[PDB]
């Protein structure tokens, strides 16, 4: 679980198998993820 | 089904490379021997899947 | 988290073919510093 408001919760979590993301949203808050190995240029 | 585009040097020992080789520390990338006046092992084949 | 039964119809197979070992979410905030509304 993890609440935003002043809250600003957004934690880099490794990616071992699939993943599951269930989200409580109103106004379209999210708007996309982010997944990559290092999140650099010597990757993809 | 997956493509590998990573020029890290490879590490064999425990001294770190830093972006070179040398000690234990090798080029994984080689390039090829196309030629045409050589045999089948130099022959280039396009290759399509 | 609400209880229930809810139905998960896939919407895209993208063949992306990469190694993947990492992820992190990401969030639009609101300008008025910078101010965020209620969300989980």
Known sequence: ?????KRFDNPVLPFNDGVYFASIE??????????????????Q | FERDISTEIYQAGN???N?????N??????SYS???????????????? | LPQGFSALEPLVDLPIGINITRFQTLLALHRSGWTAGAAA
């Not at chain 1, 679980?1 to 408001?5: G, K, P």
């Not at chain 1, 379209?28 to 982010?34: A, D, L, P």
Request: glycine share 12%; aromatic share 18%.
């Open chain 2, 25 to 30: 520390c090798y080029f994984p990338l080689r």
């Open chain 1, 26 to 43: 109103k106004s379209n808050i999210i708007r996309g993820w982010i997944f990559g190995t290092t999140l650099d240029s010597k990757t």
């Open chain 2, 19 to 23: 972006g070179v080789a040398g000690f």
């Open chain 2, 34 to 49: 196309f030629r045409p006046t050589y045999g089948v092992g130099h022959q280039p084949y396009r290759v399509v899947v």
């Open chain 2, 15 to 17: 001294k770190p490379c």
């Open chain 1, 1 to 5: 679980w993890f609440h935003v408001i």
